[PDB]
Amino acid sequence: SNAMLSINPNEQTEKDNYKLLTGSIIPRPVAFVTSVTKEGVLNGAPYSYFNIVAANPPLISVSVQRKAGERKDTSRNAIEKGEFVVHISDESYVAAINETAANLPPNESEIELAKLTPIESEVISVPGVKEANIRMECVLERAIPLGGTEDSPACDLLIGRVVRFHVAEHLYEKGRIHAEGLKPISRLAGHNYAKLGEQFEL
Amino acid sequence: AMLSINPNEQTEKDNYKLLTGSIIPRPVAFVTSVTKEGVLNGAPYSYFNIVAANPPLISVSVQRKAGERKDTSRNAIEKGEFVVHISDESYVAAINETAANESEIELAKLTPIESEVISVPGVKEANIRMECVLERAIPLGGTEDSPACDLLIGRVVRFHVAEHLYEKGRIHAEGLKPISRLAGHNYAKLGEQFEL
Ligand SMILES: [Cl-]
Ligand SMILES: [Cl-]
Ligand SMILES: [Cl-]
Ligand SMILES: [Cl-]
């Protein structure tokens, strides 16, 4: 009736802690993020460690993991350009988003691999993809290295300031977004995802 | 067929509406914290997610009120500790009662429970909760003299998980029945799962 387990993160592995965090903190919204390399290549990848930071000005966060203490393409590109695009992930293109999640060699475009379509941004110099129903042009407010060791951070928490919103007209009503028309997708544990659940009001 | 909207033109409330209606669904942290005088506070926050697994780090972005910290962030900074509870269908009604602006816990009829590592109590009603130490409180947005929020980075020092939810390290999502926030006063239950 209330059997509770105590679990000490110091007494289990990183993978064990990962499984507990990703299974407990659910559902998670998924940012599909595009960024550009110094060589001009358009990268894209999904990140479920995504949320709002503030509305004044509009600030969002995406935590991008490092590989053995080194920044991933998305973080490197965001810091180098100071710009990136955050797209809302939805049922209409989640198949293509999933295709991007695989590991290409650096400086290969997951966007082109996944048959997605670049669309130039208005304020920033990093394109997004046309397939998204909502996307946000961002400038990088700060990148915060976190976790891991003094010398080898586990991740970089990217704080992005939205400088342009692009919203499908059919989703927009009096400043609000039709959640059931959007059909956002979310991430659970493992390779499980979730569609938007039944709504309720309090 | 796409609208282009400059956030600098529209109002803070207009931007608030677009963010909260677009970045969905959001998991809801019910967070307890203690004042200098030992009063237990609790409030829900949907600007919540994982930061990293090594060590286990989480984030909660707590909005200010006219440039002043809310109780949760003031309390977290003073104590260096706080408890994050997963919000779920079995006690969302009580969680909602604590959003009101004394102890929110008593009001909402929730049940304090002492923590193992930290000195901030949690509530028994949660099926999953995480004792956290404060790593960072980062003021963001707003003006330099009036920030918009404090982004709290917590390190998990103890997990507490209902046994019926726990299967050799994994959590049964269907058993948990987590709740999520959408725009306005709208929430969502966990949706239909699929594999990728
Ligand atoms: Cl390219
Ligand atoms: Cl990552
Ligand atoms: Cl808040
Ligand atoms: Cl305690």
Side-chain angles (χ1 to χ4, degrees):
Chain A
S1 175
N2 197 42
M4 299 286 290
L5 309 181
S6 173
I7 302 170
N8 184 339
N10 296 132
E11 296 174 357
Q12 54 177 25
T13 64
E14 173 174 353
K15 186 166 151 185
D16 295 333
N17 289 314
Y18 175 83
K19 294 164 62 176
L20 205 43
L21 286 164
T22 57
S24 300
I25 300 168
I26 55 160
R28 297 183 302 285
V30 180
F32 178 62
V33 180
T34 55
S35 63
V36 176
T37 71
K38 285 197 306 327
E39 293 70 37
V41 172
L42 183 61
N43 282 130
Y47 298 94
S48 76
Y49 299 1
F50 171 43
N51 218 312
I52 304 167
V53 168
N56 168 40
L59 298 176
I60 63 80
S61 56
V62 179
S63 185
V64 179
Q65 301 310 301
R66 292 207 183 181
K67 287 211 190 282
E70 304 299 327
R71 295 182 179 87
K72 264 167 192 203
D73 283 347
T74 297
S75 299
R76 282 208 300 269
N77 293 347
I79 291 167
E80 181 50 34
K81 300 291 201 189
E83 297 175 345
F84 55 99
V85 181
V86 175
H87 305 78
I88 299 306
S89 302
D90 72 43
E91 293 184 30
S92 71
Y93 76 118
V94 63
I97 294 166
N98 188 240
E99 286 201 30
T100 73
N103 198 80
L104 296 190
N107 211 39
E108 297 290 345
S109 176
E110 296 89 349
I111 298 312
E112 298 293 356
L113 177 92
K115 302 190 183 102
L116 289 169
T117 309
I119 185 159
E120 265 170 13
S121 287
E122 293 174 11
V123 177
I124 62 174
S125 83
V126 171
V129 300
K130 185 180 167 73
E131 289 76 8
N133 292 277
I134 301 174
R135 75 181 194 283
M136 291 166 280
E137 298 179 27
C138 295
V139 298
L140 181 67
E141 282 295 328
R142 70 175 71 194
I144 313 163
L146 292 170
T149 63
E150 202 167 315
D151 293 4
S152 293
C155 71
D156 295 278
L157 185 59
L158 304 181
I159 305 305
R161 174 165 64 88
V162 180
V163 295
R164 196 69 91 236
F165 286 102
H166 298 276
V167 180
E169 187 273 351
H170 73 275
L171 296 179
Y172 183 101
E173 165 72 315
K174 297 192 255 253
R176 303 194 142 85
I177 300 299
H178 289 133
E180 257 305 313
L182 179 59
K183 298 185 155 50
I185 63 96
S186 54
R187 189 81 181 272
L188 308 181
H191 295 289
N192 278 16
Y193 294 68
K195 304 180 191 185
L196 184 61
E198 170 181 62
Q199 298 185 45
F200 64 95
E201 310 174 51
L202 256 50
Chain B
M2 301 289 291
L3 307 176
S4 171
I5 298 166
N6 183 355
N8 281 164
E9 283 208 37
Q10 63 178 15
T11 68
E12 176 176 349
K13 289 168 201 311
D14 294 326
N15 289 318
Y16 173 84
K17 287 164 59 178
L18 280 191
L19 288 162
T20 60
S22 303
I23 300 173
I24 54 160
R26 295 184 305 284
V28 175
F30 174 65
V31 181
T32 54
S33 65
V34 182
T35 65
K36 167 85 158 216
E37 297 311 311
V39 180
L40 184 61
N41 283 143
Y45 297 96
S46 75
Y47 303 176
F48 170 43
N49 217 317
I50 304 167
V51 169
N54 173 33
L57 295 177
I58 62 82
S59 55
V60 179
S61 184
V62 178
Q63 302 309 288
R64 293 213 178 180
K65 272 162 146 259
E68 298 309 313
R69 294 185 182 91
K70 285 176 192 181
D71 293 332
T72 299
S73 47
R74 184 205 54 236
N75 291 347
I77 291 166
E78 198 275 335
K79 305 289 191 180
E81 299 175 344
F82 58 99
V83 183
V84 172
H85 303 77
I86 301 305
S87 300
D88 74 37
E89 289 182 33
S90 71
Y91 80 117
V92 67
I95 292 174
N96 194 240
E97 296 292 316
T98 72
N101 195 179
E102 299 314 282
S103 185
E104 291 92 353
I105 305 321
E106 256 166 31
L107 175 85
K109 306 251 156 48
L110 292 166
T111 311
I113 178 143
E114 81 171 31
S115 290
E116 294 179 3
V117 181
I118 63 172
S119 78
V120 172
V123 302
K124 292 181 75 155
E125 285 79 2
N127 270 347
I128 300 175
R129 80 179 187 282
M130 291 168 280
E131 296 180 30
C132 297
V133 304
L134 182 67
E135 296 280 322
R136 302 286 288 280
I138 308 177
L140 295 168
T143 70
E144 285 180 38
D145 279 19
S146 194
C149 67
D150 299 277
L151 178 62
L152 306 180
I153 305 300
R155 178 167 58 88
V156 177
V157 299
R158 191 70 92 249
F159 293 95
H160 300 271
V161 176
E163 190 273 340
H164 68 281
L165 297 180
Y166 185 79
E167 187 70 60
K168 301 188 169 188
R170 299 205 171 80
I171 301 291
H172 287 122
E174 323 73 30
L176 178 61
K177 299 179 187 182
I179 66 86
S180 56
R181 189 83 181 273
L182 312 177
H185 55 205
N186 302 292
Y187 295 73
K189 299 181 186 177
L190 182 68
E192 177 188 339
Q193 302 188 38
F194 64 95
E195 195 167 51
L196 296 171

